Design a protein around this ligand. Structure first.
Ligand code: SAH
Ligand code: SAH
Ligand code: MG
Ligand code: MG
Lengths: 382, 13, 382, 13
């Protein structure tokens, strides 16, 4: 009911291309745009999409507490919300991943009764998984701010991935336009030596910010981080990835309670699923085409879709309206205000399609766009 | 060259 | 040099809108598209963007090992790469976050000497941070697969965020079109009781997959997860968020070595930065407008951009070419093949702009698009 | 209703 809204969106890390379609649609729809980005091509792109943009970066200053900057950034956005404007804040990467003023501005907007939403974006950690060819699932992922990691003595797991953000500004709470020398970097290296040993690999990661750039994926030993010429390479957009040093064994009680053993024993805990983490120290070559793999590939020749497979069975009119709801914030607002009125004014919908949109039920819509074979006789209703 | 410097979190406590 | 390439991209979680601009551009440019997605509107959208698409979901079957499905999915993509095609694989969310066949297919393609890249996307964890209004930085984040969490007895930190994926299929290595009953869910609840206590909150999180849907953000006690009517609500797209139960104190030795104390003591470790995590048990109301905040806001009236602030100073021709490099994979390939030839055939560039593109140096391009004030006299060169 | 079921990782060991 109340006039004014705050939508905070991300740009992703790589210039322009890592922005989501919905982030772009909200930037275009906004009355006012406030942005804080990491390259001028992304800034130029944003200014082509909205006539009313403010750069939040101008609220940093030499020796000015970042906390004071964050308060000001948040207040500039919430002031325009209180005036009844649809405001979009734009932060590079994911706007809620290692960002103070987005969470502050949204909490204030929400607490005062305005519509407030964060749209997720592609973070530096998302880029890290893609560029270093690792999956956080295998074998779990710990993510920390480097100064917080040290000050609160946050635990590491030698059996899981470790990701450290802000390794270029250890112990620095203020700002300088020319960056910092990172004189307390050795305190971080001391902690990594204690946890992992002097010979353990650390990957210096910088995601490409321009589309033609290659990422920095430079493996050093903990010991090599003490060399001044290596330490000096760590800057404002540097992230560290520390791979596991060991594989963790399985718990026999859980194996029993989950009934994972048909009868008795198996080979090993080290018989890895291909591919192996290429950053882990002393990990063996894993065979991609084991006999089991070759047998699975041989079955492709005679493959047919299972009876319970649900083929897409939709229409141009239905795919057009679902695309419009995703890419047009005004259409989505209109639909959310009155499902029936909206549904009945969409041309060329089938009766089922119209009925599904009228209800707004996610399951009805899925059902209208996919063939449900008799065999599927699922429990979606039960 | 360690640029840019766009740090938008911290201190955390 | 070698014919054929594999690019794996994501769709994000929310239908269509959470796809990145670059993911869309690669889907449009591909000779062949292989996809595995979580809603039919996204599937329909993909089929409008490329004439040659294959649904990978048809390679699941009842009682068929997911490992055999993953081998087949990977082989269907690499077969087309070996034939010299530009192949795009599409997985929902981030295609490398809790995905086996993407990493497999890329490692095989890379090992055989083909061009292989993963483009990051918006994961379910990215959605979780946005919808639950938490920052992984505050106070660190542990992310696990629920079965792996139990089988390898992965450590929790009561002082950090915990995120568990695949909580709806504890101990299940195969597949059923109608889903699973999740009969071993109680083994997970037992572990959460041991680590956190019966009264500790667990947030049942499901990101909206359709643009009009609200996310599920349902807080339960560990004890409430034992109620059959609550346990039954956990399905294939369910994630758990477990908030910290305590704030971790600062280490005095690190405080000293980072020189964080001007003279002596301070109030507390609990004087939180606004806003507080709303999911944490028994966390006090934090004041958003402390006297320090009010003083920072008062300074906005007399604010001017600092002398070292670098205003955008570019041209339509330069912003157009940087946008084209981000949104046109063919233009990017042409540019990467011959910087000089490409740069010299861009119309309307200034001499500086042409020179920067000729070099391809990220710093030269940034310099050509931003005004460097004399004051900045930075060390970017030193 | 717990749908969809698109599990594309695991077992992890
Ligand atoms: N290009 C890049 N490559 C790697 N890490 C980067 C990066 N840009 C930023 N970061 C990381 O992010 C920190 C700043 S905090 C902002 C992070 C951003 N919101 C995101 O979603 O990723 C940096 O100190 C660094 O650790
Ligand atoms: N809509 C949704 N909301 C919350 N979690 C979801 C989700 N869809 C998938 N997930 C999580 O992801 C698991 C499948 S693994 C695939 C994850 C996907 N690649 C991503 O980037 O997120 C699910 O069991 C669940 O834990
Ligand atoms: Mg590690
Ligand atoms: Mg926790």
């Amino acid at each position: 009911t109340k006039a004014g809204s705050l939508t905070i969106v991300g740009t992703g890390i790589e210039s322009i291309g890592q922005m989501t379609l919905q982030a772009l649609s909200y930037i275009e729809a906004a009355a006012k745009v406030f942005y804080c980005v990491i390259d001028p091509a992304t800034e130029a792109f944003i200014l082509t999409k909205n006539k009313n943009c403010v750069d939040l970066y101008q609220y940093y200053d030499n020796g000015k507490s970042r906390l004071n900057t964050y308060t000001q950034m948040s207040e500039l956005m919430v002031r325009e919300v209180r005036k009844g404007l649809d405001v979009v804040g734009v932060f590079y990467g994911h706007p809620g991943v290692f960002v103070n003023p987005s969470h502050r501005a949204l909490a204030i907007a929400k607490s005062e009764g305005y519509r407030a939403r964060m749209l997720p974006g592609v973070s530096a950690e998302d880029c890290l998984f893609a560029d270093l060819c690792i999956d956080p699932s295998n074998p779990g992922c710990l993510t920390y701010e480097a100064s917080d990691f040290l000050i609160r003595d946050r635990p590491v797991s030698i059996h899981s991935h470790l990701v450290l953000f802000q390794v270029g500004c250890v112990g620095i709470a203020d700002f300088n336009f020319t960056g910092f020398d990172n004189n307390k970097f050795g305190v971080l290296v001391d902690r990594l030596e204690q946890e992992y040993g002097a010979e353990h690999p650390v990957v210096h990661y910088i995601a490409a910010m321009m589309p033609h750039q290659d990422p920095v994926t430079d493996k050093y030993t903990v010991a090599q981080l003490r060399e001044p010429e290596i330490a000096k390479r760590v800057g404002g957009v540097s992230t560290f990835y520390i791979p596991p040093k060991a594989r963790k064994a399985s718990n026999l009680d859980i194996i029993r309670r989950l009934e994972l053993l048909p009868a008795g024993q198996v080979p090993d805990k080290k018989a890895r699923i291909y591919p192996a983490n290429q950053w882990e120290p002393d990990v063996p070559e894993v065979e991609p085409y084991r006999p089991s793999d070759q047998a699975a590939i041989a079955q492709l020749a005679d493959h047919a879709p299972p009876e319970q497979y649900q083929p897409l069975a939709t229409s141009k009119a239905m795919s057009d309206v679902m695309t419009k709801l995703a890419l047009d914030p005004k259409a989505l607002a209109d639909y959310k205000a009155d499902h029936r009125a909206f549904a009945q004014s969409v041309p060329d919908l089938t009766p089922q399609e119209r009925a599904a949109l009228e209800l707004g039920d996610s399951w009805a819509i899925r059902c209208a766009m996919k063939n449900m074979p008799s065999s599927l006789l699922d429990a979606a209703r039960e | 060259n360690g640029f840019p410097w766009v740090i938008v979190v911290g201190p955390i406590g």
